[PDB]
Amino acid sequence: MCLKLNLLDHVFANPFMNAAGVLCSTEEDLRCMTASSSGALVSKSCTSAPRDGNPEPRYMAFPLGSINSMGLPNLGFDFYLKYASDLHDYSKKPLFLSISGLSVEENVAMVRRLAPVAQEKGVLLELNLSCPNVPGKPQVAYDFEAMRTYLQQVSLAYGLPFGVKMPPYFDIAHFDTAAAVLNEFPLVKFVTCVNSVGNGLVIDAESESVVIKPKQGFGGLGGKYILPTALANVNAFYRRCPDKLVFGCGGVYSGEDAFLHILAGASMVQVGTALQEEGPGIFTRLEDELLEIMARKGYRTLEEFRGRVKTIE
Amino acid sequence: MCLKLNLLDHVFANPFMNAAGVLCSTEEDLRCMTASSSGALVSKSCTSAPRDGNPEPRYMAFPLGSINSMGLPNLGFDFYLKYASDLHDYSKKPLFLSISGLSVEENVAMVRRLAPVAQEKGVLLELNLSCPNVPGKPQVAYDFEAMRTYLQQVSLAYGLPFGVKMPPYFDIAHFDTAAAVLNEFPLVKFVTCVNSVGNGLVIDAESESVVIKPKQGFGGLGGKYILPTALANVNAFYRRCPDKLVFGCGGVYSGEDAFLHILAGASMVQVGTALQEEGPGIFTRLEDELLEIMARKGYRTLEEFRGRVKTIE
Numbered sequence: 141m142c143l144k145l146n147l148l149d150h151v152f153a154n155p156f157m158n159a160a161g162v163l164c165s166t167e168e169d170l171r172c173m174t175a176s177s178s179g180a181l182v183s184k185s186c187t188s189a190p191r192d193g194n195p196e197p198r199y200m201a202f203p204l205g206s207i208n209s210m211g212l213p214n215l216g217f218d219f220y221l222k223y224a225s226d227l228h229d230y231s232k233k234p235l236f237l238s239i240s241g242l243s244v245e246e247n248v249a250m251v252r253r254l255a256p257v258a259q260e261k262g263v264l265l266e267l268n269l270s271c272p273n274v275p276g277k278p279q280v281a282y283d284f285e286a287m288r289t290y291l292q293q294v295s296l297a298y299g300l301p302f303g304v305k306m307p308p309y310f311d312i313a314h315f316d317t318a319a320a321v322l323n324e325f326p327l328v329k330f331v332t333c334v335n336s337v338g339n340g341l342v343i344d345a346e347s348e349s350v351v352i353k354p355k356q357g358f359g360g361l362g363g364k365y366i367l368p369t370a371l372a373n374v375n376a377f378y379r380r381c382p383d384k385l386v387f388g389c390g391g392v393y394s395g396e397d398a399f400l401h402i403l404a405g406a407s408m409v410q411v412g413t414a415l416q417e418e419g420p421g422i423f424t425r426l427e428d429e430l431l432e433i434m435a436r437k438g439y440r441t442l443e444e445f446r447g448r449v450k451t452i453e
Numbered sequence: 454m455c456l457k458l459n460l461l462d463h464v465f466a467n468p469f470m471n472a473a474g475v476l477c478s479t480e481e482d483l484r485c486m487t488a489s490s491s492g493a494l495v496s497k498s499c500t501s502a503p504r505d506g507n508p509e510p511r512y513m514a515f516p517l518g519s520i521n522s523m524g525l526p527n528l529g530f531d532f533y534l535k536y537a538s539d540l541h542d543y544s545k546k547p548l549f550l551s552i553s554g555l556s557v558e559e560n561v562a563m564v565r566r567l568a569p570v571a572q573e574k575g576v577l578l579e580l581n582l583s584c585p586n587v588p589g590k591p592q593v594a595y596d597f598e599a600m601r602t603y604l605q606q607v608s609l610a611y612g613l614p615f616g617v618k619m620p621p622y623f624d625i626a627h628f629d630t631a632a633a634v635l636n637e638f639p640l641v642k643f644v645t646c647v648n649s650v651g652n653g654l655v656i657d658a659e660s661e662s663v664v665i666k667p668k669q670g671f672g673g674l675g676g677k678y679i680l681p682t683a684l685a686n687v688n689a690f691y692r693r694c695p696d697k698l699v700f701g702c703g704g705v706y707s708g709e710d711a712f713l714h715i716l717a718g719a720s721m722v723q724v725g726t727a728l729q730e731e732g733p734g735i736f737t738r739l740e741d742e743l744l745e746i747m748a749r750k751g752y753r754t755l756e757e758f759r760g761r762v763k764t765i766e
């Protein structure tokens with residue numbers, strides 16, 4: 141019985157990794173993730189210039205999940221590139237490097253420079269599309285023409301296999317259109333579903349107040365709130381993008397939640413809010429819980445059940 | 454102390470009602486809602502002809518909420534019109550009638566017939582904008598040009614104050630666009646936020662199966678999953694539509710949940726999943742719990758705290 145995967149020309153001890161943005165901003169964070177029993181790690185989504193991000197409080201968690209409007213705080217691309225080229229120990233586990241430029245030009249500038257490091261050290265690119273572009277327009281992956289433009293330009297500039305982090309969709313027509321855009325780009329080899337459920341609002345009844353400062357308290361939702369949404373998006377893209385891998389992200393707190401993602405079609409499984417709350421210890425627990433479920437069902441490998449969710453009649 | 458209120462030229466004993474689709478399909482349901490302690494009731498969204506809906510199982514509930522792909526089963530517009538015209542006791546509480554035709558033409562035809570009954574009896578119209586659109590396009594409320602057409606055509610055909618039931622939005626640009634559409638229409642006097650969070654997927658780990666039969670197990674989410682989504686949409690519309698009322702729907706299980714909706718800007722609060730699960734007794738509990746929160750805070754009226762959610766700095 142084993143959790144091993146081989147994909148994207150890399151070998152992974154198990155499918156678990158951090159979600160971008162959690163436990164991955166600083167060298168200390170990245171060394172912590174590397175020391176953990178995760179099968180991989182992803183570095184904080186970065187911009188060309190470092191960013192302090194939004195005023196605090198900008199993240200809060202609760203029993204059912206989390207809300208955040210972090211404002212993309214990060215050490216800048218040069219730092220994450222250095223980590224990739226010089227500091228990471230690839231013998232421990234593979235590394236993903238997430239980028240999230242604020243314009244298509246900023247993404248192209250970063251991927252051009254990433255490429256030789258990707259080719260030489262084998263770091264894998266995750267491009268974050270669940271990101272702002274022009275204020276007053278939708279985030280990039282909610283504007284299909286902007287999305288196509290970003291993917292054309294990054295495909296040209298990078299020239300190597302990469303993946304994309306997608307926001308959740310809620311309408312079948314959007315699943316259809318979004319997958320068809322992705323399917324234009326053969327270098328897009330994996331699709332991570334999903335980023336936070338956008339612009340929720342948490343209100344504390346006692347104080348009669350919102351809980352985060354930016355955007356009058358509106359921010360992205362993660363955790364138990366979003367698991368069915370995340371499974372829907374994993375499965376929708378799994379069904380529509382047969383030549384791509386799907387990575388699942390959203391609502392994983394247990395080996396059972398991981399198992400559901402994998403039945404929906406997930407290859408790797410990312411953990412955000414639960415990791416933020418529990419710490420990197422969570423990965424040993426997740427592995428143990430998922431292996432217990434596999435043993436009770438007689439499953440020896442992940443491929444025995446990946447994408448095999450049953451439908452009714 | 455009592456929770457009585459006046460809006461849309463009607464008087465309401467309290468701000469609670471069922472959500473469209475729950476406990477409101479049949480004469481028996483409507484009589485049960487009428488006998489409850491709710492302040493108002495809304496009938497099932499209807500089409501010109503009766504519909505059986507989708508194959509079962511089509512609704513399932515869990516500790517954190519519900520998933521449905523009902524397929525709009527309903528008795529037909531003639532039935533709900535007759536209910537509004539001849540059977541409902543308006544001395545007991547106000548009635549809302551929800552319409553959701555499969556085309557603009559069908560909606561116009563229904564509203565032309567409802568208008569004289571709205572005039573004579575005071576039934577209120579809730580137009581459900583999660584209704585199907587032309588090939589390739591998302592539901593009507595997600596296609597702003599279609600939504601503008603529907604509202605123009607209904608406004609002309611109906612000619613009286615009405616409301617609209619909205620799906621959730623997840624993007625601030627979308628809130629801006631959607632609100633500006635609604636704000637073109639002076640007859641749109643209330644906006645209900647929100648319908649179910651679209652196309653989630655619930656999977657049972659033991660059986661490795663989805664839990665509803667239609668659409669390969671994909672369906673709308675309600676209940677605890679959606680409360681922060683619901684509050685964001687209530688507040689976004691409350692901020693953007695100063696000349697309209699906002700009705701909150703989503704995630705209400707307690708007076709505290711109702712209190713949060715009202716703080717976010719809700720005038721009436723609709724109960725869906727929790728009503729389906731707990732039954733019509735829930736209305737007396739909700740009233741008691743909301744009054745108890747008011748008493749502890751020193752609030753004597755809903756008006757004292759409606760829309761008064763505090764932001765940070």
Ligand SMILES: Cc1cc2nc3c(=O)[nH]c(=O)nc-3n(C[C@H](O)[C@H](O)[C@H](O)COP(=O)(O)O)c2cc1C
Binds near residue numbers: 162184
């Ligand atoms: C504090 C915080 C920061 C995040 N920053 C990023 C980011 O920089 N890039 C990104 O792609 N997603 C970001 N996310 C989203 C997570 O990667 C993840 O998609 C989302 O939280 C859902 O997973 P969960 O339910 O496990 O939290 C962030 C999430 C949190 C909570």
Ligand SMILES: Cc1cc2nc3c(=O)[nH]c(=O)nc-3n(C[C@H](O)[C@H](O)[C@H](O)COP(=O)(O)O)c2cc1C
Binds near residue numbers: 472475
């Ligand atoms: C079984 C079922 C049937 C529903 N049918 C309708 C409907 O016919 N029209 C409509 O506007 N919303 C319909 N809804 C959506 C609800 O009115 C409500 O907006 C949604 O369930 C979220 O509220 P909740 O969190 O309280 O469930 C339905 C919901 C359920 C669960």
Ligand SMILES: COc1ccc2c(CCc3c(C(=O)O)[nH]c(=O)[nH]c3=O)cccc2c1
Binds near residue numbers: 212270
């Ligand atoms: C104000 O500047 C930004 C920059 C990045 C943002 C992003 C992208 C970064 C990001 C963030 C974040 O940094 O806020 N949070 C997530 O849950 N997922 C993400 O992908 C989302 C929403 C608002 C943003 C505002």
Ligand SMILES: COc1ccc2c(CCc3c(C(=O)O)[nH]c(=O)[nH]c3=O)cccc2c1
Binds near residue numbers: 584673
């Ligand atoms: C052709 O099958 C459909 C399915 C859903 C429909 C709907 C949505 C009805 C609805 C349903 C539903 O009955 O599935 N469930 C919800 O959670 N919200 C709703 O608003 C409106 C108009 C026509 C429709 C036709």
